[PDB]
Design a protein around this ligand. Structure first.
Ligand SMILES: CC(=O)SCCNC(=O)CCNC(=O)[C@H](O)C(C)(C)COP(=O)(O)OP(=O)(O)OC[C@H]1O[C@@H](n2cnc3c(N)ncnc32)[C@H](O)[C@@H]1OP(=O)(O)O
Lengths: 156, 159
């Protein structure tokens, strides 16, 4: 059986290995020391769940953080989304999504956001199934980003 | 017009919400306004705020609302979530002046990663931000802004 639970400092080794998996999947910094140094400390800027089979081992993760929307109020942003290849399509990806849903309400967040890769069609179809809205296509939102000098200039 | 940009104080929440409502009312999307004045005060003027707000004051006629994130591609980052300037003050460069400050906040914090989203109709801001060093993300990388709103949320939580 599988259980989606909040992560503990003890899972930071597995989480680091899963961060290097998902990104390799998405194609393009944070050592274990970094994970504990912020993800738990006392002033966490981000938290997460660790899909764990019950020998008991970490088989995927979901990390999120609290952001803000001017239409509803307390929002939740679900960043990284990844399940081990052998363990996909068997309900785990959704259980992580549902858990993020529970945390949202429990924390006064009625809605939740996230970004998605265009070629990553399967996931998009997953999110749409569970009720998500592709605001990029349903409204026209175009993510935009500055890096280094670009931000320096923007700042005037 | 004689205007200054400044950090919002809990007392600016009434004007911030009034402005948010004026916008939504303009787009005929009022019914989508679920935020509250009490939430604006609490969600950012207590323990650990969900957002930060800069207001353009002459009478508050505009605002900028941001906060930081924690993705996984480049680490911490400042993110602009919304900017509004009353119609009577458009063309004055206030919104342009507000964004510059949000960028200065990031740099002042030691962060050079600045993110945001742009509306599809905007044909100047985009090509402009590019001439600055930025790059649209949805037209290129294929990044799509997905949103699980209220109906889907509760349903997922089990309700
Ligand atoms: C915000 C983001 O971070 S988006 C990044 C998402 N991550 C990735 O693409 C990395 C590689 N893939 C994965 O990690 C997983 O395949 C996930 C997270 C996308 C989906 O988790 P899964 O456990 O495979 O999906 P789960 O079984 O819970 O499926 C729920 C729905 O998604 C669909 N789905 C999405 N991806 C897959 C997949 N790779 N294999 C099988 N089904 C998939 C299912 O068919 C199901 O849809 P349906 O009800 O219409 O049939």
């Amino acid at each position: 059986s599988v259980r989606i639970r909040e992560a503990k400092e003890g899972d930071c080794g597995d989480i680091l290995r899963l961060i290097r998996e998902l990104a390799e999947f998405e194609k393009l910094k944070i050592s274990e020391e970094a994970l504990r140094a912020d993800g738990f400390g006392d002033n966490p800027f981000y938290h997460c769940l660790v899909a764990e089979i019950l020998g008991p081992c970490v088989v995927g993760y979901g990390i999120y953080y609290f952001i803000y929307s001017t239409w509803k109020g307390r929002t939740i942003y679900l960043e990284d989304i990844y399940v081990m290849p052998e363990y996909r399509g068997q309900g785990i990806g959704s259980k992580i999504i549902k858990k993020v849903a529970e945390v949202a309400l429990d924390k006064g967040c009625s809605q939740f956001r996230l970004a998605v890769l265009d070629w990553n069609q399967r996931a998009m179809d997953l999110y749409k199934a569970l009720g998500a809205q592709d605001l990029t296509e349903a409204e026209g939102w175009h993510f935009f980003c500055f890096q280094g000098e670009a931000t320096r200039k923007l700042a005037g």
